[PDB]
Amino acid sequence: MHHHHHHLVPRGSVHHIKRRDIVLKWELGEGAFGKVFLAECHNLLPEQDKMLVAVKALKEASESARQDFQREAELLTMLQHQHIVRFFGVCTEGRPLLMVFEYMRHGDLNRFLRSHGPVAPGPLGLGQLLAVASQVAAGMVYLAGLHFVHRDLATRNCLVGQGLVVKIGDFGLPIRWMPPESILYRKFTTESDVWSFGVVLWEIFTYGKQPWYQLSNTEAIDCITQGRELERPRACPPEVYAIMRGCWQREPQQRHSIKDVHARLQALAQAPPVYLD
C-alpha cells in the first residue's frame, strides 16, 4: 500500500496520545480508511488545556492493516509544512486504532469552492482564488522536495482553515485528475502530480466543478488518453490558463516544474491581473 514511499526513511518516533486524552464529539465523515470524528484533545500542546482535532478511526484489526497503519503514521510524522495537514500522532491503546490531525474548521476545499461560488460568506474573488491556488502549489513544492508522490491531488483532498489557510491531505482510481501515463501505465511521479495540480487549478477556477463533467467515466478515460485538454474556465485569466497548459504537456518531462508554477502563482496572487469575465 505504501511501497512507493520506501525511499522515505523516518528520523524519530511517532507521537503517542493516551486514549483518555481524546474526547469524541461527532462524525465529520468517513470514506475509504474509516470514520473521521471531530474531537477535543487534552495535553497535546503545553499552552492549551484542550483543542479541537480530527480523529480517524481505523476499521480493520487486521493485522495487515495494522502494519500499514504504523507505516502510514511514520510517513505522516515526516510531513511538516504550513500547507500540509498537521499530523499529531496516534492512539494505539486498544481498539479502534486512532490517528489525530489538526482540525480545519471550514472542511474540504471542494465543498468550500462550491459554497463560495458566483469565514466571510459570498463569492471568492480573483485574489482569493489565486491565494488558494498558491497555497496548494506551496504544499506540492514541499512534497516534491521530499520525493513524496501524492497520487490523488484534488480539491476534495485539501482542507480550509481559519483565515482561508489551505492544506493538502488525502482522505481516500481518480481518473479525471490523472495524466495518460498514470491511466495507461500506472506511472505516478512528481510529473503526474503536476498534471493533477493543473486539474486542481481548473477546479479552483470553475468553483469546484468536476473535471470532464460533460463525459461518462469511460468517455473521460478515452479523452485523456487521446490528448483532449480541459477548456479555459470563464473566471480564469489568460495568465492562469497558461499555467494549466504548462502542467498538461503530454510528455511528462515537458511539464512545468511545481517550483515555477508556485512562483508564477505567487506573483499573480500578490498582484492580481485586472481580468473580468
Would you tell me which residues interact with ligand 6K0 (CB under 6 A)?
A: 28-29, 36, 54, 56, 76, 79, 84-85, 101-104, 107-108, 143, 150, 159, 168-171
DSSP code per residue over 192-244:
HHHHHHHHHHHHHHTTSPPTTTTS-HHHHHHHHHHTPPPPPPTT--HHHHHHH
Which CB atom, from 5 or from 232, has the smaller least distance to ligand 6K0? 5
Which CB atom, from 53 or from 131, has the smaller least distance to ligand 6K0? 53
Whether 222 is catalytic is: no
Smallest gap, in angstroms, from Cβ of residue 212 to ligand 6K0? 23
Smallest gap, in angstroms, from Cβ of residue 180 to ligand 6K0? 23
* Residue entry with cell 486512532: 98
Q: Is 32 annotated as a binding residue?
A: yes
Q: Is the dihedral of CA 249, 189, 212, 136 positive or negative?
A: negative
Q: Of the listed 49, 68, 108, 152, which one is catalytic?
A: 152
Smallest gap, in angstroms, from Cβ of residue 149 to ligand 6K0? 10
SS3 121: coil
Which CB atom, from 101 or from 241, has the smaller least distance to ligand 6K0? 101
Q: Is 33 annotated as a binding residue?
A: yes
Q: Are 247 and 194 in contact (CB under 8 A)?
A: yes
Cis amide prior to 272 (ω within 30 degrees): yes
Q: Is 107 annotated as a binding residue?
A: no
Q: Is 31 annotated as a binding residue?
A: yes
Which CB atom, from 22 or from 168, has the smaller least distance to ligand 6K0? 168
Backbone angles phi, psi at 28, to 5 degrees: -95, -30
Q: Which residues is 165 bridged to in the sheet? A: 161
* Distance separating alpha carbons of residues 130 and 267, to the nearest angstrom: 10
Q: Is 117 annotated as a binding residue?
A: no
* Distance separating alpha carbons of residues 147 and 137, to the nearest angstrom: 15
Smallest gap, in angstroms, from Cβ of residue 55 to ligand 6K0? 8
Q: Report residue 167 CA to chain centroid gap.
A: 7
Burial environment of residue 128 by CB neighbours within 10 A (0 to 12, 13 to 18, 19 or more)? middle
Q: Is 76 annotated as a binding residue?
A: no
Which CB atom, from 85 or from 236, has the smaller least distance to ligand 6K0? 85
Q: Report residue 50 CA to chain centroid gap.
A: 27
Smallest gap, in angstroms, from Cβ of residue 216 to ligand 6K0? 27
Q: Which residues are annotated as a binding site?
A: 28-36, 56
Q: Which residues are annotated as a binding site for ATP?
A: 28-36, 56
- Residues acting as catalytic residues: 152
